[PDB]
Amino acid sequence: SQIVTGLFKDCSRETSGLSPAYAPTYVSVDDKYKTSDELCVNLNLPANVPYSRVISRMGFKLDATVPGYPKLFITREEAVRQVRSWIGFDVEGAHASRNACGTNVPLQLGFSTGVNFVVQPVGVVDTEWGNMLTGIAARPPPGEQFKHLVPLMHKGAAWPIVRRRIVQMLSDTLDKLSDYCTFVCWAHGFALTSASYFCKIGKEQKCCMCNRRAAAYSSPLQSYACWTHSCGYDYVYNPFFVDVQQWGYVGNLATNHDRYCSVHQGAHVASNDAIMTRCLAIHSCFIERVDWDIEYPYISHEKKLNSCCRIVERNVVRAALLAGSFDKVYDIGNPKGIPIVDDPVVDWHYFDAQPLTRKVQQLFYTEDMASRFADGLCLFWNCNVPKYPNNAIVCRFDTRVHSEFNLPGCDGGSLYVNKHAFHTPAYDVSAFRDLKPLPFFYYSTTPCEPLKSAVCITACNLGGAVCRKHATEYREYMEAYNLVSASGFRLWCYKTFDIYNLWST
Amino acid sequence: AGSNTEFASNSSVLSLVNFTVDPQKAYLDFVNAGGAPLTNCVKMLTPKTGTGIAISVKPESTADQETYGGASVCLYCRAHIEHPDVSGVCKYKGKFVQIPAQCVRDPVGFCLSNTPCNVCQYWIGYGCNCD
RNA sequence: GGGAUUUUAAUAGCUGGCUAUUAAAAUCCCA
Ligand SMILES: [Mg+2]
Ligand SMILES: [Zn+2]
Ligand SMILES: [Zn+2]
Ligand SMILES: [Zn+2]
Ligand SMILES: [Zn+2]
Ligand SMILES: [Zn+2]
Structure with a gap:
């Protein structure tokens, strides 16, 4: 009506406006043509055609709402x-x-x-x-x-x-x-x-x-x-x-x-x-805010991926509990106090920063509680802490690997999207200075119902042979572990771990 | 620098026309939904004693028509986008357009929805009689 | 070179105040 905008500004250096038949708007008409009632009079003065005037594209506002047309400036x-x-x-x-x-x-x-x-x-x-x-x-x-x-x-x-x-x-x-x-x-x-x-x-x-x-x-x-x-x-x-x-x-x-x-x-x-x-x-x-209600659809193998992390975590937790005769476990970052395995009977404690259930303690970890947690194992499964203690089982995503479920993030971190979106700090080899990389192994204890493996903890391997059931289970866990490792997760263990102690049972 | 040309209120629709695949359908869906039609058109003072044809080199409006500057009632000249015509030449620019008096609410929409007759050069349904 | 906020000058309009355009001063963003 009365507010003019810089959009479609006449950027020409011409000192006068255009004739009414050539001017696109009433504002751009030269004043010699205008009258009192906002109308224009076709004067006998000749037009100055041909001409070329640069028109500005500065000032677009895509705020119009039309049915059927989507909203492109989203919240x-x-x-x-x-x-x-x-x-x-x-x-x-x-x-x-x-x-x-x-x-x-x-x-x-x-x-x-x-x-x-x-x-x-x-x-x-x-x-x-x-x-x-x-x-x-x-x-x-x-x-x-x-x-x-x-x-x-x-x-x-x-x-x-x-x-x-x-x-x-x-x-x-x-x-x-x-x-x-x-x-x-x-x-x-x-x-x-x-x-x-x-x-x-x-x-x-x-x-x-x-x-x-x-x-x-x-x-x-x-x-x-x-x-x-x-x-x-x-x-x-x-x-x-x-x-x-x-x-x-x-x-x-x-x-x-x-x-x-x-x-x-x-x-x-x-x-x-x-x-x-x-x-x-x-x-x-x-990082500044956390939604936690927004769910994202799956893309490639999220369900199978989570199943494989659960299988691998169960196996490594059971083996670490059996080796070294550890009788206590602290699980830091547990959302709802869910135990992983219970066949080796150990005491369990649970901590988190934003618990979903009152049974889980509110805690942030800054290495000051290493003396607080020195009497048991510490589980850091997908728990991001800049410096892990001496005796722990840690699984951490290698943010240097990018995939469909892993996007680049802030300050070297990566946005890992699987159902929910978690921002993970940058992977750092110095954080595991008190730990060692876990070698591959498989521990089986169920009764039996050709394959050679030197890291397969198995009563048949104790006898120098292999059975079909344990072979199939070992190959299935091989698929699971390979999917977990290729997806980006890396496993770190306390220093004194060795699979030979698993020969005890 | 430069000289301003358009009002702010029009900047919502013309920007839309600058981005859409079909500018004519975009403008007609914008106006039909209740949006404000384009303002700031060059409306001329005429003696209302013309021949009443649709497009002319000079104002030719009768008593039941209003004459506008042709470059102002063209959507593609207002949005400064490419014309759909053959060889890219606007058929309105440089000429004067007669709009029926009961359609001066939206001259741009009228020019987008109607076309003049080939034989008599009147608006079809608004002065054309070739039956 | 483009724009936003505050103030000022001129012009025009409305009913001592206000609005709009143009220009100027300051701060910020963009190039
Ligand atoms: Mg830049
Ligand atoms: Zn396709
Ligand atoms: Zn950055
Ligand atoms: Zn066996
Ligand atoms: Zn045109
Ligand atoms: Zn006809």
């Missing part, structure tokens, strides 16, 4: 559910110069996958017959801080090529993770302006070759496809957008990121900014 709670779709996104731009002044065009796009795309300076030019999206004269931002952007002015590629490269990178990243793309931006204005160059929106669509949700659009074919069928597609379809600065952060991106993380140090480039933005989002959502 925090919806972004947490879409955590597998998170791709960091930075844009560094160039100022329009020469013919125009008053808009910025994208120059380098950076993504959290470590990829940078350099583009030719392209803007919208309004002409007396319509409009084009064509290359315009530009200039790197002045000052020392942007001196690295000077070579990029002579290295850009065409936008239709960079579009397909972006779609192919997104397809290679998000094929096995999600059907959606969520751009995690820090200042979403220029990011959305540059996202207008390679993204399309609309109603939700189905892939043309399968049943998955469509995530890319093909203009030459006018078709929609998912990440598996997006070969040759040139547009991203219905991406989500997240503005981290709107989550309550004061200052710039670098001081907010470096407050919590010291892993993502590097030179100034858009990919580094994107990585820092996604890392700050991960810290904001999974």
Whole structure:
């Protein structure tokens, strides 16, 4: 009505407005034509066609609500559910110069996958017959801080090529993770302006070759496809957008990121900014706050994986309880006080930081309780403590391995998603300085009902032979242990452990 | 620098039109759902004594029509996106568009929903008689 | 070069106050 906006600003250097038949709005009409009642009079003064005026794309607001059309600027709670779709996104731009002044065009796009795309300076030019999206004269931002952007002015590629490269990178990243793309931006204005160059929106669509949700659009074919069928597609379809600065952060991106993380140090480039933005989002959502009610759907083998961790944990706990004649066990991090094995009878105690049942103690571990817990074994199954005591059984995820259920996290940690999402601190070999890596073994004690193994604790192996039942059980536990080890978990034990003591029974 | 062109209130719909695959369906679904139609159109002062054709080089509105600047009642010129026409030339820009008086609530939507006649150059159903 | 908040100057409008546009000053974010 009366508030003007910087969107579609006439960035031309012309001193006068346009004629009524050529001007797009009433505001852009030159005043010589206007009258008192907000109408325009077709004056006999000739028009100044042909012309070319650069039009600004700064100011997009995707806040309209239309039925059938999805909401693409999601909240925090919806972004947490879409955590597998998170791709960091930075844009560094160039100022329009020469013919125009008053808009910025994208120059380098950076993504959290470590990829940078350099583009030719392209803007919208309004002409007396319509409009084009064509290359315009530009200039790197002045000052020392942007001196690295000077070579990029002579290295850009065409936008239709960079579009397909972006779609192919997104397809290679998000094929096995999600059907959606969520751009995690820090200042979403220029990011959305540059996202207008390679993204399309609309109603939700189905892939043309399968049943998955469509995530890319093909203009030459006018078709929609998912990440598996997006070969040759040139547009991203219905991406989500997240503005981290709107989550309550004061200052710039670098001081907010470096407050919590010291892993993502590097030179100034858009990919580094994107990585820092996604890392700050991960810290904001999974370290500062804990939801614990949001469940995520399974992807590849979560159920079988959890079954294998339970089997491996039962075996190692039973063997460690039998060897060394330990009579006491402290389980730190137990959510509900669930014992693992009870055939070797030992005393049990349970601790946690956020217990789900009053039977479990509220505790944080800082090595000061090593003298408190010196009379028994300490179990640290998926319990993250920077320094483990002398006599313990510890299982820890190696965050240096990334998979479908393990995403990069904050300060070297990793977000492990299986039903619930847990942020794990970085794997450190120095944390296990009082422990040793567990060798592979299998302990069987059930009665029997060709295979050779030198680490199979078995009464048949005591007799120098092997039976079919124990062989099948050993091979099944081999599959279980191999799945556990390949998934990323590593086992650490007290120093005095040796499987020869298991020959006692 | 530069000179502003559009109001803030329109910035919600035009941005939508800048991103959608089908801008015409996007605008019509936005307006039909109850959204505010585009404002800030170049509406001219006419003597209301014209021939009443749809698109003309000069204002030609009759008593039951209002003349608008052609580049203002085109969705693609307002959103500054590519035109669907052959060779990319707008058929409204540089000319004047006559809108029926009972449709001045949304001139852009009227121009998106209606097309002029090939033979007589009047709006189909609003002055065209070729039966 | 783009924008947000506060203040000021000019212009226009409304009923001593206010609103909008343009410009200027400060702080912050973005390039
Ligand atoms: Mg940046
Ligand atoms: Zn598909
Ligand atoms: Zn970081
Ligand atoms: Zn046997
Ligand atoms: Zn047009
Ligand atoms: Zn006709």
